[PDB]
Each structure stands twice: as structure tokens, then as C-alpha cells.
Amino acid sequence: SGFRKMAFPSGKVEGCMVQVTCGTTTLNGLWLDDVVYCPRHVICTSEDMLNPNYEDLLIRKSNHNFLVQAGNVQLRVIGHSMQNCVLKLKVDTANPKTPKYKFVRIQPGQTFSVLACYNGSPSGVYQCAMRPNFTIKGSFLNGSCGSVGFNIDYDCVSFCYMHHMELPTGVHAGTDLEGNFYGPFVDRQTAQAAGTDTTITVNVLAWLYAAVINGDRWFLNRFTTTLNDFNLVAMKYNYEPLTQDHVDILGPLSAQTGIAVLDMCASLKELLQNGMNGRTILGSALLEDEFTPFDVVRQCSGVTF
Amino acid sequence: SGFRKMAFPSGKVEGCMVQVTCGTTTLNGLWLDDVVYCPRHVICTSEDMLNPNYEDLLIRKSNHNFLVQAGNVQLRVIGHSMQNCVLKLKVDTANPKTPKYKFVRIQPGQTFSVLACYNGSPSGVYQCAMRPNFTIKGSFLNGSCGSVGFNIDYDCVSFCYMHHMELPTGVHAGTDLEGNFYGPFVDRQTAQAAGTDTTITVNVLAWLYAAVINGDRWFLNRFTTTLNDFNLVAMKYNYEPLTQDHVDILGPLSAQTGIAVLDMCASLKELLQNGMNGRTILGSALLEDEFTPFDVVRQCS
Ligand SMILES: NC[C@@]1(C(=O)Nc2cncc3ccccc23)CCOc2ccc(Cl)cc21
Ligand SMILES: NC[C@@]1(C(=O)Nc2cncc3ccccc23)CCOc2ccc(Cl)cc21
Numbered sequence: 001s002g003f004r005k006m007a008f009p010s011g012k013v014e015g016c017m018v019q020v021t022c023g024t025t026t027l028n029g030l031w032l033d034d035v036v037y038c039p040r041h042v043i044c045t046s047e048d049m050l051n052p053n054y055e056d057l058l059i060r061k062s063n064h065n066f067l068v069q070a071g072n073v074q075l076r077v078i079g080h081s082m083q084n085c086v087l088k089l090k091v092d093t094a095n096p097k098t099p100k101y102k103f104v105r106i107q108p109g110q111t112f113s114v115l116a117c118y119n120g121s122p123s124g125v126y127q128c129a130m131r132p133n134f135t136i137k138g139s140f141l142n143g144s145c146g147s148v149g150f151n152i153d154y155d156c157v158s159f160c161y162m163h164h165m166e167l168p169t170g171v172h173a174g175t176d177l178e179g180n181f182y183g184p185f186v187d188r189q190t191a192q193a194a195g196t197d198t199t200i201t202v203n204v205l206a207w208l209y210a211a212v213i214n215g216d217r218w219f220l221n222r223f224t225t226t227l228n229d230f231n232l233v234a235m236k237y238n239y240e241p242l243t244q245d246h247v248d249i250l251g252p253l254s255a256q257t258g259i260a261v262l263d264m265c266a267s268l269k270e271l272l273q274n275g276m277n278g279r280t281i282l283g284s285a286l287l288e289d290e291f292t293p294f295d296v297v298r299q300c301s302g303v304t305f
Numbered sequence: 306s307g308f309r310k311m312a313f314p315s316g317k318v319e320g321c322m323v324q325v326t327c328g329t330t331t332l333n334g335l336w337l338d339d340v341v342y343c344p345r346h347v348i349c350t351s352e353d354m355l356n357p358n359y360e361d362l363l364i365r366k367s368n369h370n371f372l373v374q375a376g377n378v379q380l381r382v383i384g385h386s387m388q389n390c391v392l393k394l395k396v397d398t399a400n401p402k403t404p405k406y407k408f409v410r411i412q413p414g415q416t417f418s419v420l421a422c423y424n425g426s427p428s429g430v431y432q433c434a435m436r437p438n439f440t441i442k443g444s445f446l447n448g449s450c451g452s453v454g455f456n457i458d459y460d461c462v463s464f465c466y467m468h469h470m471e472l473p474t475g476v477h478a479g480t481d482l483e484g485n486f487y488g489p490f491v492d493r494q495t496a497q498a499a500g501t502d503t504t505i506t507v508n509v510l511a512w513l514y515a516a517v518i519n520g521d522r523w524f525l526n527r528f529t530t531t532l533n534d535f536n537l538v539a540m541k542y543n544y545e546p547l548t549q550d551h552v553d554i555l556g557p558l559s560a561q562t563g564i565a566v567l568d569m570c571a572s573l574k575e576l577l578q579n580g581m582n583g584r585t586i587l588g589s590a591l592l593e594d595e596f597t598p599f600d601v602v603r604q605c606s
């Protein structure tokens with residue numbers, strides 16, 4: 001019993017974290033095989049960030065301008081190239097701790113673990129969701145750039161996020177490991193804002209199933225709804241539309257608890273229109289949306305890595 | 306910016322998790338140097354659990370009755386002993402991945418990361434606090450026994466908890482790494498219940514300071530309180546008493562934000578009286594109590 005916000009075990013990723021320094025700028029890099037990946041803004045000074053020409057700033061750097069430290073060992077940079085907003089530093093040593101990995105681009109609503117790092121040293125691990133507005137509500141201080149987000153699917157680490165920036169509202173923006181930003185963001189010190197966010201409906205439903213599995217049933221009711229009527233309610237409350245794909249994905253949880261997906265939608269509709277009336281669900285007074293249906297099944301079944 | 310429930314990176318502990326089997330029972334063990342630590346109830350069958358005589362059950366076991374698996378490698382058990390509710394299995398191989406470590410017994414209100422494991426394999430990592438009633442609100446299924454709680458301030462892992470049991474309310478009980486239970490619990494299936502739980506006041510205050518550091522001030526007020534009046538109000542909402550030690554521990558956060566501890570206590574009293582009125586504090590509609598003053602300083606600017 002119990003239901004916690006749980007991250008994947010971070011060990012496989014910890015063995016890949018390195019410190020990357022270029023001039024006065026120091027941030028984190030991800031060392032996989034013979035390449036160290038890091039935000040391309042490591043080559044910028046604060047003035048360069050106002051309007052950077054990354055190709056022009058990079059052509060002025062030699063391999064020796066990049067200092068890569070893995071633990072207490074200095075790696076030798078033997079090449080440097082840019083792919084979108086990520087800088088790739090070829091090093092003379094393949095990381096002996098390189099796990100089985102892949103680079104995956106995730107969709108809004110998908111969750112991942114973040115290994116927050118400073119000076120190439122892991123400091124903490126937390127579970128995030130990619131918001132519908134493409135930001136993450138992370139916890140990052142100055143020096144955290146280059147920290148990565150990941151999932152584990154069997155024994156393979158799927159890297160899905162690299163941290164680049166903090167927006168004025170305190171939320172975060174980054175890229176996939178191919179350097180493509182999530183969201184309409186750019187790696188420049190210019191006015192940028194997170195758009196209006198919405199709640200991840202399929203994740204709220206998954207978390208309501210987790211509550212039922214854990215013995216919290218007060219919010220259940222005799223009613224059901226149509227998918228179209230539920231979406232009319234969900235739109236009114238700044239909830240993401242629930243698709244038939246979402247309904248299908250919730251099938252196993254629906255069969256396990258005996259509550260059809262549209263039966264759980266009727267519970268959620270009532271919660272949106274009436275609130276919780278002083279009650280909590282899994283120790284929360286808000287509807288949690290940072291657990292996917294897969295996270296709920298994984299946590300409730302004890303899948304290991 | 307941002308404030309998240311954050312666990313320590315678990316890698317150092319993942320490299321210590323092993324599977325321990327004794328007969329039909331399988332659980333997790335912690336392999337440090339040449340010793341594997343695990344709950345002594347690994348020697349019990351389900352029928353032994355009501356009134357086990359662990360000394361008598363253990364004397365009947367030899368080293369070869371304990372099967373320890375580390376990855377796909379079977380370790381050789383060359384000795385065994387019991388220390389309180391923990392079984393210590395001496396093995397013929399020192400763990401090459403043994404981090405710098407120590408065993409620490411924590412007090413209620415302290416937080417720690419839990420690496421939940423099954424069959425010696427890590428499944429997830431989460432953040433917990435030792436409740437005032439000496440339970441932890443974990444997430445543990447059957448087979449999770451022997452999973453550990455820890456902190457990693459610097460590169461030294463301080464192991465503070467080993468999981469042993471789930472109580473009827475769904476909360477968890479365990480021991481320190483010397484096998485002493487937290488709380489009045491015993492490793493028997495006899496009727497046991499968690500005592501009434503209370504909120505960790507010093508942690509709620511630390512988290513209100515985290516909210517002020519992150520730019521939120523809506524809950525502040527022009528009032529202060531005496532420590533005694535604060536405690537008289539706090540106890541009515543099932544909050545733990547705030548001691549002068551707690552006030553002293555909050556000193557650095559108080560100096561950083563410019564809000565005296567008793568001034569923050571007045572804000573907490575008002576929040577307890579009024580609720581949040583549709584507002585949130587650090588993305589929460591409830592007062593959070595699983596961040597210590599030390600956690601807030603470590604995480605915040
Ligand atoms: N260092 C790069 C920087 C940043 O946001 N970094 C940070 C990243 N995450 C948390 C932060 C907390 C406080 C301070 C900076 C943070 C600086 C500001 O302007 C920019 C502009 C664009 C980009 Cl792609 C990055 C950045
Ligand atoms: N297997 C040992 C057991 C237990 O609580 N295990 C578990 C531990 N944590 C989560 C659990 C979730 C579901 C099922 C069992 C759980 C069995 C029940 O009676 C007892 C009694 C005492 C002790 Cl020290 C352990 C135990």
C-alpha cells in the first residue's frame with residue numbers, strides 16, 4: 001500500500017553526468033559512449049545570450065576551450081559540433097558506465113525523472129510531467145543547465161529532456177537530446193513566457209484509479225457520462241480533452257478496479273463542479289496530474305530496473 | 306526557482322541491493338563491504354510470524370540456508386548473526402560498489418529517500434519522513450522488505466531505515482540499520498496499530514519559509530505570537546508542539562527571509578483557522594510537512 005511520487009532509480013544516469021566548462025560558464029553534460037552532450041549556450045557569456053549567433057561563437061572555440069570533468073578525471077575533447085540547441089563534444093574515452101540508452105522525444109502529459117545536477121554532480125532526483133504548455137515545473141537553480149530527464153523501459157534508459165532555461169514564472173524549458181526545444185522557446189535572453197497551462201486529464205483519471213486501488217473510494221458515484229459530454233466539461237475547467245486513445249490506455253485500470261473509464265469521468269466531473277468538500281484523495285486536496293496510467297500500473301505492480 | 310519533493314540520487318544505494326532467500330522467503334538485502342543486512346523475518350514462514358522465537362529459528366540455520374544473489378551472481382554466505390531485528394550475513398566478497406557510508410538513527414520529522422526494491426532490484430525512489438508516530442507513509446508492496454531509506458549529504462550515504470512491515474492502515478514500520486525498530490513496533494504479526502498521527506510543525510514552518518524564498522507572501526500577516534500560545538493553537542489541529550530547538554533550527558531561514566520564527570508561527574495559526582481560500586502555496590492546497598529546515602536550505606536559493 002501507499003502511493004508516492006516516485007522517480008526511476010537514477011544510478012544509470014548518475015554514471016553519465018559530467019561537468020562542462022567553457023570560459024567562465026560551467027554547466028552539466030551527459031557523457032554517453034565518446035560524446036558529451038550539453039546545452040549549446042555553454043559557449044555564451046551573458047551579453048552573447050542577448051542575441052547569440054551560435055555558429056559564429058562556436059567557430060572561435062578550439063577543443064581545448066572545453067574542459068570536461070568526469071569525477072576527478074579530466075576528459076580530452078577531440079571534436080565539437082552542434083545539433084540544434086545541443087553541443088556535442090567528442091571525447092577520447094568512451095564512458096565505461098554507458099548504459100543501454102536511446103533518445104526519445106516525449107509528448108505533453110508524459111512523465112519522466114529529472115536528475116538535478118550542479119558541477120557535474122547529481123544533487124537530487126524528482127519526477128516531472130511535460131506540461132501541456134511544454135514547460136516543466138522543475139526545481140532548478142543556477143548551474144543546473146544540462147541536467148537530464150529520463151525514463152527506464154526494461155533495462156534501457158530513454159533520455160527525453162535536457163535542461164536549458166528558467167522562465168519568469170519559475171517554470172522550466174529545455175530540449176530533447178537532439179536539441180529540439182519542447183515548446184515555443186528559444187535559447188536567448190529575450191522576453192519569453194509560459195503559455196496558459198491545462199490539466200492532464202488522462203493522468204488525473206489514472207491517479208483516481210491509484211486512489212481506488214489504495215482504498216480511497218469516497219469520490220465514486222453511480223453515474224457514467226459520454227466522452228463528448230465529459231470533454232464539454234473538461235474544456236470548461238481548463239482540462240485537456242480526453243481521447244479514445246486515453247480511454248483505451250486506462251482499460252487495464254478500469255478492469256482491475258471495476259470502474260469504467262467513463263464511470264471515473266463522471267467522478268471527475270463531479271469533483272470539478274463541486275470540489276472535494278473538505279476531503280482529500282491520496283493525501284492531496286488538488287487533483288494530481290503528474291502520474292500517467294503506466295506510472296500507476298508500474299507502481300501498483302512493483303516493476304524493477 | 307521551483308520547489309519539488311526531491312529524493313537523493315539512488316545510484317550509491319542501487320549498487321548495494323541484493324536478493325536474500327531463506328527457504329521459501331525472498332526479500333531484499335543491503336550489501337556493504339562483506340556483510341549483507343536484511344530483516345531477520347527472512348527466516349520465518351508465514352506460520353512463524355505470530356510469535357517467532359528468532360534465536361531458536363536462527364540456531365537451526367546454517368550459512369548454506371541463505372542464498373544471496375547480487376545481479377546474476379550468487380554470493381557465498383560464510384557467517385551469520387542477528388543484531389536486534391536485523392540479520393547480518395557475512396559473505397566471501399566485499400561489495401566493490403560499497404560507497405562511503407554510515408548508519409544513523411533518525412528522529413521523527415526527519416526526511417529520507419527510499420529506494421523501493423523487489424527481488425534485489427530497484428523499482429523506484431521517493432522521499433519520506435519519519436512520522437511523529439514512528440511510521441512512514443511509504444509505497445511498498447509484498448516483497449519490498451529490506452528496502453532502505455537514506456540520505457546522502459556530500460558523497461557519504463547515511464542509511465537510516467530498513468523496511469520490515471506494513472500496518473493495517475497502510476503505513477509502514479521498520480528499523481534503523483542496527484535493527485532497532487522506530488516506534489513501539491515488533492516484527493510479529495500480532496495486532497499492532499499506528500498511534501494517532503500529527504503534523505510536523507517545524508517542517509510546515511520550513512516549507513512556509515521555502516514559499517517566501519520562492520516569492521510567495523500572501524499568507525503572511527502583521528501578527529506575531531508567543532511560543533506557548535502558538536502551541537496551544539497548534540495542538541488543536543493535531544500539530545506537533547514546536548520547541549525552542551525548532552525555533553533555533555529555523556533561525557537561518559528566518560534571517561534569510563526577514564520573517565521572525567514567531568511571526569511565521571502567526572501566519573501558520575491563521576492558515577489553520579482560514580484554510581487557503583482557493584489559493585495554493587508552492588503548488589499545494591495542503592500544508593506540506595515532509596520538508597525539513599535542512600531540506601529547504603539545501604533545495605532553495
Ligand atoms: N544560465 C542560462 C539562463 C537560465 O535560464 N538558466 C537557469 C536554468 N535553470 C534555472 C535557473 C535559475 C536561476 C538562474 C538561471 C537559471 C540564464 C538566463 O537567461 C537564459 C536565457 C536563455 C537560456 Cl536557454 C538560458 C538562460
Ligand atoms: N512480509 C512480511 C509482513 C509485511 O508486513 N510485509 C509487507 C511489507 N511492506 C508492505 C506490504 C504490503 C502488502 C503485504 C505485505 C507487506 C507480512 C505480514 O505480517 C508481518 C508482520 C511483521 C513483519 Cl516485521 C512483517 C510482516
Ligand SMILES: [Cl-]
Nearest residue numbers: 410411412415
Ligand atoms: Cl534526525
